[PDB]
A = this chain, B = another copy of it.
Amino acid sequence: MDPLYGYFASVAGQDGQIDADELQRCLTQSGIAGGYKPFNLETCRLMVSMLDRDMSGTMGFNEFKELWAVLNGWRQHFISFDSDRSGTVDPQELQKALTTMGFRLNPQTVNSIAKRYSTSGKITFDDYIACCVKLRALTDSFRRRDSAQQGMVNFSYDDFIQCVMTV
């Protein structure tokens, strides 16, 4: 029996699928934020997108399982830059943080990202996560199309729009 199945079973529908609302509820019940403020609906809708390679708009337990482990790792990284347990990190940390967790980005990019994701000059745990989710999803969709890994993908307007608007 999977330690996570209980939470899932609790909100999941008879089809074994949960939506962003339900996801947020069991993520909350799982206590994964562990200390920090539980994630919010919009952030959860994004986690759904990152694992919904179906346009189903829901996820199943195997996915829930995978999500939880990713999230748990990211919270670990974040905590390491949250010396003072504040639930926020500042813009400069984020460049170091983003970099040091499997993300392959140049300094410029990281800074603009750090920028857009700041509220009052700091970046909260929740926003840090949302950033990482969306960052992982888009990199997956990119890699998907970069079938020669040239770090170059020739989008078509419609593909570019649907690809990004759905994440």
Contact = CB atoms under 8 A, between A and B. Distances in A.
Interface of A: 42, 49, 55, 57, 104-106, 108-109, 112-113, 115-116, 118, 131, 134-135, 138-139, 142, 146, 151-158, 160-162, 164-166
Contacts of A115: 55, 57, 166
A42 B158 CA distance: 25
Nearest to A143: B157
A110 B137 CA distance: 20
Contact of A164 (B104, B105, B157, B164): B164
A138 B105 CA distance: 20
B42 A162 contact: no
A166 B42 contact: no
